[PDB]
Structure 1
Amino acid sequence: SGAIYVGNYRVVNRHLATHNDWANLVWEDSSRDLLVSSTTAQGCDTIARCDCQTGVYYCSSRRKHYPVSFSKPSLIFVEASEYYPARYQSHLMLAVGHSEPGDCGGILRCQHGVVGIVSTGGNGLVGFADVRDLLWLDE
């Protein structure tokens, strides 16, 4: 689990969104595994606006942060689960690293700020849903 709080927005994995997230929906995209809902309180996370390919992610299944090299956002094939059929997930970045399903929502950060959140994994590869292109999160 985990979310990004910026301004009056909350960014979470769409497959983990709550009833309150859907009742205050701003935007959602199944192909990206993202959902953004509105909040009453002000968020202070900084979103990175860059093309960094190195960062640090939080892995809850190890209670540790790991430094990683990651690919540019792209369309990557993702196996079926209880939340989605087998499909291509867009805006996804992969890195060599550990993850388990409950790790979804852990933040990936670079020197400029928040890059994305853990969204997929398997075979020693972890995938992050990019949020750097969502320029509207700041206004």
Structure 2
Amino acid sequence: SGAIYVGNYRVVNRHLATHNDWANLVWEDSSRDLLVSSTTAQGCDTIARCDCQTGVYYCSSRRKHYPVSFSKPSLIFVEASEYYPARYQSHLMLAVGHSEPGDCGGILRCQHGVVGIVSTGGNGLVGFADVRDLLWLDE
């Protein structure tokens, strides 16, 4: 579990969205596994605007923060699941690191702020859904 709270917005994994998120929907994209909903209270997470390829992520399955090197956002094939058929997930970044289902929602951060959230993983790898291109979250 996990989410990003910036201004009057809440960013979560699309496959974990609640009834409230769908009733206060701003934007959603199945190919990115993202959903953004409106909030009554102001959020104070800083979103990063960079091309950093190193950072630190939180892993709930180990109660630990781990440093990682990660790839540039791209189209990566994701195996069929209970939430989606077999497809290409866009804007995804991979790193060598531990993850298990339950770690989705964990935040990835560099020195400039929030880079993205855990969305896929396995085989000794972890996948992060990038958010640095969504400039409307700040304005």
Instruction: Specify the TM-score bucket, using the shorter chain as the normaliser.
Output: over 0.9
1:8 and 1:38 map into 2 onto residues whose CA distance is 6
1:80 and 1:97 map into 2 onto residues whose CA distance is 22
1:89-124 Cα distance to aligned partner (Å, 9 max, x none)? 000000000001100000000000000000000111
Count of equivalent residues: 139
1:112 and 1:2 map into 2 onto residues whose CA distance is 20
Question: How many Å apart are 1:56 and its aligned residue?
Answer: 0.2
TM-score, length of structure 2 as denominator length: 0.99
Question: How many Å apart are 1:46 and its aligned residue?
Answer: 0.2
Question: How many Å apart are 1:65 and its aligned residue?
Answer: 0.3
More helix by share: 1
1:31-89 Cα distance to aligned partner (Å, 9 max, x none)? 00000000000000000000000000000000000000000000000001100011000
2:88 and 2:122 map into 1 onto residues whose CA distance is 15
Gaps of 5+ in 2: none
Question: Would you say 1:94 and 2:77 are equivalent positions?
Answer: no
2:16 and 2:37 map into 1 onto residues whose CA distance is 12
1:59 and 1:137 map into 2 onto residues whose CA distance is 25
RMSD of the TM alignment (CA)?
A: 0.3
Question: How many Å apart are 1:129 and its aligned residue?
Answer: 0.1
2:80 and 2:61 map into 1 onto residues whose CA distance is 22
2:77 and 2:94 map into 1 onto residues whose CA distance is 12
2:83 and 2:8 map into 1 onto residues whose CA distance is 27
Aligned-pair identity in percent equals 100
Question: How many Å apart are 1:17 and its aligned residue?
Answer: 0.2
Gaps of 5+ in 1: none
1:12 and 1:135 map into 2 onto residues whose CA distance is 17
TM-score, length of structure 1 as denominator length: 0.99
1:39 and 1:118 map into 2 onto residues whose CA distance is 22
